[PDB]
DNA sequence: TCACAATTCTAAAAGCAAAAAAGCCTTCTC
DNA sequence: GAGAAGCTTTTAGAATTGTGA
């Protein structure tokens, strides 16, 4: 499946039990079509490439 | 680099913390979005079905 | 803290002589030998089960 | 006394058994085995002169015409192991055969030949071994895997309980050749002997007997007994052996020599065995119906019809009795039946047997055999005495005879490796044997039964193979016969031998890819033992019983280092003391105890040889003179272990670690530790990798120098001398006159190896570590390869440690490190990468390296020079171009317009596609160095020739630094050859270094040593000259490559990996762990002292887990280190020698009695400050495995520095500046970093490619790629109610094309909603089930 | 006849991931 | 050289035949 990723867990025991800790690199990565959805929303970048 | 869970989660997944791995998947449509956060949030899932 | 006490081989005829030694003193090296029996049954039961 | 390596540094050396045994070479395995293979052997046992002496020479079909073997050769390799690496081929030596043909006349098959006819033969090469024990195939370094297999011959198994679900045990014995075919001899549930050959249709044993020429009379006389019946006044009075009916239930009254013996209904007891023995009774009355249940045994014709009475072999009735008592037939020979002891089970056979005759027999065999065609007289005898009777296609080695003839109990151990009459005779009668009572069953896991292939029976069975099929050809090729012509290297075809070795070396199971990230890791997958492999069992068919440890395993195998998962069990490795027999089995050492006392000669017995002797155990205890101190022992005499009178143990143990692996003995307090903890922790110590900085243990076992001394690692001085010279890349020892050559002056030159990268892409990396001017022994290291510490093997770093809980921060099995850790740099590795970008040959034009690629800016081209590759040195990031190449995709035109602008580029009309070689994202790295392989025939660009005049100018400096520095101690020696006998200091000097044998010196023996030193002088020369001359000519050799490929460049980058969230980080006890946080300074726990602890640990882990000598070594690191305090504020507030030397004599000199002995009387003041410098990080300790220390020495060790004895002090919180309640234990472990790094694991994907077939995505992080959503998540969704989750993963996310591009567009147009489509995996499938008859189709709405 | 039973042929044997290497018919030219 | 022509798992179920009455 596409929109997936791996990495190894380690704990956070800051969180709530309804979050988890998420990497910037892996959410910059499997996020990609909602960024440019927003980013041409703001007009930040007016064609898609 | 490394997804940051819960601590008490860890029994349901029966993960432990010496070099585990766990893959992460995306809902995309706005239903599944909806089954995520009504079925399967584990703030739902207290209980075992067994 | 007390002996570790019994082990069978792997026939599961139950060795005639105890380890009467525990683990913060030492076992020497036939107890540990027989323990060693009793180890390497036990992963190969988990991982072939 | 001791070696000056070992005077910088002692380990405070426990245990308190004197060792009488040195650790042998750990690497002998494999050289040994690898030196028989390649050695001219007169007599012709072993390796190539085997496998020739047994193939040659030809006889051809009645030709007249042979080929004769006279010896063989092998060259020099044309690289050497280094330049073969860089170069990518296989380092290996040519094999040259001296063979002779000669042939013979008409009517002159003995006489004198008419010619003979001899020169050289090339037979392909041989992969030659490296001083290490390792293989270079294609550049990489492979290892051959020893193999324990099943050993050739005669195995009698029981299969008891699960066949017939009866209760009844069946019995088999099987005959195993080295190379041949299998041989069965089987039960069945109705007990008749079937035979199966090879495994085919299961069939009447007696056939075979039949088919060696046994009439059935034959038969029944060897695996039967005979019984009398003599016609006499009536009743035929039988003549009884005495103990025949011993046991057998009497039914008749038995009167001879007018006494009666025995009453109808009562057996013949011991009493009655007494009364026939004394009576002597022999012929006794008996009636009639004894013989009606009897067999005759001997064919029984009729004389005076000239005709047939009865059959050999068929129950008899009364009215036959009365034939053949008419017939003149006087004496009937039975056979001695029974119930007890002698089963029918041959006459039973025969009974069943269909066949009548030898002809029936062997067609029946082939039939059996190769089914289908018609059974012919020839080819039936053919086959069959081929199966088994053939030099060509049967074979029991030296091996297998041995065994053989062991197991049915002839005397003779040598004999012949084909199977005869008498050997399969007796393999029957000893399974019969079995079956009637007297006798028992093999075992198949005892190690006596199991043997050692290594790589030269392997490499040498292989070449036998090529060998044969190489004599087919000749064969041949020869039989077709021309004469006078026909030089004997025509018909040789190098081919198969060489295709036959290339697919032994290069791909096989057992020659795998080196494992090497670690000096202990290399060297315990060099002493690795395989239950796999080709001719061995498999993964998922080993049971358990070869699963397991069996009590022969004792001091050959180890118990505790085996991989866990899948093939736990079948990878053992090999003990620190086990050997191998002549044979192939594997043996250990004892020491003989005779008459009490313990002698000290060392015997090496094997699994079949232990059994007959009880043996001692190691750590009994011996006092004064060598005596028993107490006067029973435990020992183990018959596979099991019990305690024993003083005076029967026979054998005593050499030392308390023989039965543990090298990897299992660099774990102190192992027996403190449970196995699997054990096990663990000893699989996890080969996958740690070399630090930034190597640390020795505080705490080892006095096994890390073998380790590290024994691999091919450090550089150990070859012959003792004076260093002469120091340098980061290389090291120069003036050898000393007691160990140099008559001539040659000469001086050890050892260049070190420098930031090369390992199969792991680790950095190996040798540092010198003497200084200049400085003594050496031979043996010592002068160079320190990675994870190596003064020779000391050092794999991770020692760190400060708390056991408590944090904040959940060390939840279940994370740890906790501080800053500190990061900012000193003490878990920083060093990666090397290579990457290859490969010009090929495509159509419409080749590739082209240059760096004018379109569409791209001068900003990424600021690194890339004139050239089109990197600079060395750059620093290059993840997405920059590393060589510029680009791809002719043909002529285009897109509008008339549009060539405009390309008349403004310059461009000229190429258009070309940009396909540069980039460095893969996320890798910051440093360009380290760079190759560049050209073909033949193609033009060396700019940078190609500054490369390669870069290397000519190193290869010069080279070889004129070594002739300068040679000749330099040449001259310094004839000078010192010139301190007596006519000396003339002042014109020494009066002439250049050059002349000096024309000096004022007597023609004596003096001046034939000048001559011997001028003439070294001028070979030298010569020497060098014609290694130059080559260096020149292979360095400007355009490099062999790829078909339809132009060049290779190879670019290196090194990165330098440092510690973060996510990294595993392990212990030597089984403590595994990932880094959860790196802490602040202040953050962490800290004592009274204001010193901070490192890193934290959880508790937890200890009880569970029952791993308790992590804590003892906490201990015990602690105590070291706080010996080693107190020499540091001594040897800061500058003391005076005296108190430093009486300290460190109280801390070496303390425990019970121990082995060794440190006086520091003998060290002559100056080297006791280096050994002060040396200690002031922590006194290290040396705690071997089973006779380590004890928690009073300890706390006596403890209490020598001012430690708490307890072991736990009072620590603080590091953020609230409150105490702690509950004293903590800190100290000091040694953490290892584990290869498994998050940087690594980490992987995500959007979008990207997808397959061909199956328009879903690629799977892996090597080429970009999704996660598996296998079946299992697939139900669990399904348990859910998660449906519309579900259909989008199977349709939008994975299959659906329309759906997925459709979802993509929705999403960056702000809408969230999917097309549900249908998958095209489904529409494959449709199509492969309708590529059958089958029709399968989607119905209507 | 018509019923047990020994042979023998057929299927099945967890999941997920990382790295590496070796390969992708014989043969017959002239 | 390039292009073709052509020798060991274990368990269990279901189908034969091989006597056995
Ligand atoms: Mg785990």
């Not at chain 2, 791995?21 to 075992?48: C, D, F, G, K, W």
């Not at chain 4, 009517?107 to 033969?121: C, L, N, S, Y």
């Not at chain 4, 290694?1027 to 062999?1040: M, P, S, V």
Request: aromatic share 6%.
């Amino acid at each position: 499946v596409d929109y997936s990723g791996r990495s190894v867990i380690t704990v956070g025991p800051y969180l709530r039990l309804h979050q988890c800790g998420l990497p910037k690199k892996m959410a910059l990565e499997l996020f990609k079509p909602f960024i440019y959805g927003k980013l041409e929303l703001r007009g930040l970048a007016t064609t898609i490439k | 680099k490394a997804i940051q869970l819960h601590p008490l989660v860890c029994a349901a997944y029966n993960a432990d913390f010496d070099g585990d791995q766990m893959a992460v998947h995306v809902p995309l449509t706005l239903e599944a979005q909806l089954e995520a956060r009504a079925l399967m949030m584990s703030t739902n899932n207290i209980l075992s079905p067994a | 803290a007390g002996m570790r006490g019994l082990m069978a081989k792997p026939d599961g005829s139950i060795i005639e002589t105890p380890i009467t030694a525990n683990f913060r003193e030492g076992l020497n090296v036939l107890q540990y030998f027989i323990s060693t029996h009793g180890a390497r049954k036990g992963l190969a039961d988990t991982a072939l089960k | 006394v001791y070696s000056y390596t070992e005077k910088k540094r002692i380990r405070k050396d426990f245990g308190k058994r004197p060792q009488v045994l040195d650790v042998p070479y750990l690497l002998s395995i494999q050289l040994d085995s690898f030196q028989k293979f390649i050695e001219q052997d007169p007599e012709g046992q072993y390796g190539l002169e085997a496998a020739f002496r047994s193939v040659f020479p030809i006889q051809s079909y009645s030709g007249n015409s042979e080929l004769q073997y006279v010896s063989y050769r092998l060259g020099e390799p044309v690289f050497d192991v280094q330049e073969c690496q860089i170069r990518g081929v296989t380092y290996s030596a040519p094999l040259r055969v001296k063979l002779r043909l000669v042939i013979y006349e008409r009517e002159a098959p003995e006489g004198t030949v008419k010619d003979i006819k001899e020169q050289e033969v090339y037979m392909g090469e041989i992969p030659l071994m490296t001083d290490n024990g390792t293989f270079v195939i294609n550049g990489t370094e492979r290892v051959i895997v020893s193999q324990l297999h099943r050993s050739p011959g005669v195995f009698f198994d029981s299969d008891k309980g699960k066949t017939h679900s009866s209760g009844k045990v069946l019995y088999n014995a099987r005959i195993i050749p080295y190379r041949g075919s299998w041989l069965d001899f089987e039960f069945d549930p109705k007990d008749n002997l079937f035979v199966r050959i090879d495994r085919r249709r299961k069939l009447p044993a007696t056939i075979i007997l039949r088919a060696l020429n046994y009439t059935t009379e034959q038969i029944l006389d060897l695996f039967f007994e005979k019984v009398i019946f003599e016609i006499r006044d009536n009743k035929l009075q039988m003549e009884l052996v005495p103990e025949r009916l011993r046991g057998e239930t009497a039914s008749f009254d038995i009167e001879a020599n007018g006494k009666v013996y025995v009453e109808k209904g009562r057996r013949i007891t011991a009493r009655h065995i007494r009364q026939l023995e004394k009576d002597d009774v022999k012929l006794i009355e008996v009636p009639v119906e004894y013989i009606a249940g009897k067999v005759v045994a001997k064919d029984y014709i009729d004389e005076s019809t000239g005709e047939l009475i009865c059959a050999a072999n068929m129950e008899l009735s009364l009215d036959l009795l009365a034939k053949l008592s008419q017939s003149g037939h006087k004496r009937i020979e039975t056979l001695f039946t029974n119930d007890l002891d002698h089963g029918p089970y041959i006459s039973e056979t025969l009974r069943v047997d269909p066949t009548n005759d030898r002809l029936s027999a062997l067609v029946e065999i082939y039939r059996m055999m190769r089914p289908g065609e018609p059974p012919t007289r020839e080819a039936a005898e053919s086959l069959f005495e081929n199966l088994f009777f053939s030099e060509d296609r049967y074979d029991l080695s030296a091996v297998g005879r041995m065994k053989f003839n062991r197991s049915l109990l002839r005397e003779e151990i040598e004999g012949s490796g084909i199977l005869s009459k008498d050997d399969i005779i007796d393999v029957m009668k000893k399974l019969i044997d079995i079956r009637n009572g007297k006798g028992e069953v093999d075992d198949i896991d005892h190690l006596g039964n199991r043997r050692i292939r290594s790589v030269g029976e392997m490499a040498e069975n292989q070449f036998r193979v090529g060998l044969v099929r190489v004599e087919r050809a000749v064969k041949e090729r020869l039989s077709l016969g021309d004469l006078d012509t026909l030089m004997p290297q025509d018909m040789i075809n190098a081919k198969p031998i060489s295709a036959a070795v290339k697919e032994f070396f290069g791909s096989s199971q057992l020659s795998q890819f080196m494992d090497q990230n670690n000096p202990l890791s290399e060297i315990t997958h060099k002493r690795r033992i395989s239950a796999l492999g080709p001719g061995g069992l498999t993964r998922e068919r080993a049971g358990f019983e070869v699963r397991d440890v069996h009590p022969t395993h004792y001091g050959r195998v180890c118990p505790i280092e085996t991989p866990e998962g899948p093939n736990i069990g079948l990878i053992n490795s090999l003990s620190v003391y086990a050997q191998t027999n002549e044979y192939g089995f594997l043996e250990t050492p004892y020491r003989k105890v005779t008459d009490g006392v313990v002698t000290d000669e060392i015997h090496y017995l094997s699994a079949i040889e232990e059994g007959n002797y009880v043996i001692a155990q190691a750590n009994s205890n011996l006092d004064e003179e060598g005596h028993f101190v107490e006067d029973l022992v435990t020992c183990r005499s018959k596979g099991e272990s019990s305690l024993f009178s003083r005076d029967q143990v026979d054998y005593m143990d050499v030392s308390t670690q023989q039965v543990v692996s090298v990897g299992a003995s660099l774990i102190p307090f192992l027996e403190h530790d449970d196995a699997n903890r054990a096990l663990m922790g000893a699989n996890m110590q080969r996958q740690a990798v070399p630090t930034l900085r190597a640390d020795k243990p505080l705490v080892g076992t006095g096994m890390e120098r073998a380790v590290a001394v024994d691999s091919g690692v450090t550089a150990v001085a070859k012959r003792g001398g004076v260093v002469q010279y120091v340098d980061a890349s290389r090291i120069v020892i003036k050898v000393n006159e007691d160990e140099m050559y008559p001539g040659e002056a000469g001086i050890d030159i050892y260049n070190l190896t420098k930031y090369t990268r390992s199969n792991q892409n680790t950095c190996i990396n040798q540092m010198p570590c003497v200084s200049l001017g400085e003594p050496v022994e031979r043996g010592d290291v002068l160079a320190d390869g990675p994870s190596t510490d003064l020779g000391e093997l050092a794999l991770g770093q020692n760190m400060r440690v708390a056991f408590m809980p944090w904040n959940g921060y060390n939840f279940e099995d994370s740890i906790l490190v501080s800053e500190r850790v990061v900012q000193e740099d003490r878990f920083t590795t060093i990666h090397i990468q290579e990457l290859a970008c490969v010009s090929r040959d495509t159509k419409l034009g080749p590739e082209e390296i240059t760096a004018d690629i379109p569409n791209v800016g001068e900003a990424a081209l600021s690194k890339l020079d004139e050239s089109g590759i990197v600079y060395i040195g750059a620093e290059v990031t993840g997405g920059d171009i590393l060589v510029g190449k680009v791809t002719p995709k043909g002529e285009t035109q897109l509008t008339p317009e549009e060539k405009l602008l390309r008349a403004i580029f310059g461009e000229k009309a190429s258009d070309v596609k940009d396909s540069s070689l980039r460095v893969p994202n996320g890798v910051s790295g440093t360009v380290i160095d760079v190759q560049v392989f050209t073909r033949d025939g193609v033009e060396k660009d700019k940078r190609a020739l500054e490369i390669e005049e870069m290397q000519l100018k190193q290869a010069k400096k080279d070889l004129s630094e070594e002739l300068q520095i040679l000749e330099a101690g040449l001259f310094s020696r004839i000078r010192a050859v010139l301190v007596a006998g006519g000396v003339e200091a002042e014109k020494l000097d009066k002439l250049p270094r050059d002349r000096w044998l024309e000096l004022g010196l007597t023609d004596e023996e003096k001046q034939n040593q000048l001559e011997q030193l001028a003439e070294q002088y001028d070979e030298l020369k010569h020497e060098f000259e014609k290694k130059l001359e080559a260096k020149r000519r292979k360095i400007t050799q355009g490099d062999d490559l790829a078909p339809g490929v132009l060049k290779i460049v190879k670019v290196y980058l090194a990165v330098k990996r440092r510690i973060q969230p996510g990294d595993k980080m392990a212990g030597r006890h089984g403590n595994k762990g990932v880094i959860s946080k790196i802490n602040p300074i202040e953050d962490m726990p800290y004592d009274e002292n204001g010193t901070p602890v490192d890193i934290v640990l959880n508790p937890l882990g200890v009880p569970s887990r029952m791993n308790i000598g992590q804590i003892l070594e906490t201990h015990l690191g602690m105590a070291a280190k706080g010996i080693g305090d107190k020499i540091n504020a001594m040897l800061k507030q500058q003391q005076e020698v005296a108190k430093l030397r009486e300290f460190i004599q109280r801390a070496y000199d303390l425990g019970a009695d121990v082995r060794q002995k440190v006086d520091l009387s003998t060290f002559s003041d100056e080297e006791v400050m280096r050994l002060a410098e040396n200690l002031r990080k922590g006194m290290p300790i040396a705690t071997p495995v089973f006779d380590g220390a004890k928690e009073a020495e300890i706390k006596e060790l403890l209490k020598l520095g001012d430690l708490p004895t307890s072991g736990q002090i009072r620590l603080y919180d590091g953020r609230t500046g409150e105490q702690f309640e509950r004293p903590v234990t800190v100290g000091y472990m040694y953490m290892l970093k584990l290869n498994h790094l998050v940087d690594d694991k980490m992987h995500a994907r959007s979008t990207g490619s997808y397959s061909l077939v199956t328009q879903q995505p690629l799977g892996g992080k090597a080429q970009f790629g999704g996660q598996r959503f296998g079946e299992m998540e697939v139900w669990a969704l399904e348990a859910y109610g998660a449906a519309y989750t579900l259909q989008e993963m199977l349709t939008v996310k994975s299959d659906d094309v329309n759906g997925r591009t459709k979802m993509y567009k929705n999403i960056v147009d702000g809408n969230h909603q999917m097309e549900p489509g249908m998958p095209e995996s489904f529409n494959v499938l449709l199509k492969e089930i309708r590529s059958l008859g089958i029709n399968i189709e989607l119905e209507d709405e």
